């Protein structure tokens, strides 16, 4: 379903690695030309996607991801990687694998995958 | 079905 950013039942702090996440690899892919789509949710109106909302069940965008660090919704950085691997996955889902948004995707989720690679140790 | 994008 849609996407909380905050919960008061949930555990959330901020550790080094929640750090890195928000400043490195938020901040990194945000500053990118391909970012654009991924700023807020998919917006099925304007895009005119009358099945996106019934195929993709659990949406996710880089600014929830934002909201959720801002928020301190987090535990672990585990969770902000499954974040972005869910945005990742439904894009590939609901894309053919030749449209641009793949192809934009890709690009940001190799730089996604090398900044995740140089996280340091908690 | 998104389209073209740059």
């Keep these: ?122 | 079905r998104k389209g073209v994008k740059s």
């Design chain 1, 1 to 122: 379903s849609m996407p909380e950013v905050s919960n008061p039942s949930k555990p959330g702090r901020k550790t080094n690695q929640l750090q890195y996440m928000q400043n490195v690899v938020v901040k990194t892919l945000w500053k990118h030309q391909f970012a654009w789509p991924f700023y807020q949710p998919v917006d099925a109106i304007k895009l005119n996607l009358p099945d996106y909302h019934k195929i993709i069940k659990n949406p996710m965008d880089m600014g929830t991801i934002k909201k959720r660090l801002e928020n301190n919704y987090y535990w672990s950085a585990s969770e902000c990687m499954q974040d972005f691997n869910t945005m990742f996955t439904n894009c590939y889902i609901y894309n053919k694998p030749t449209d641009d948004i793949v192809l934009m995707a890709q690009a940001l989720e190799k730089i996604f995958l090398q900044k995740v690679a140089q996280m340091p140790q908690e």
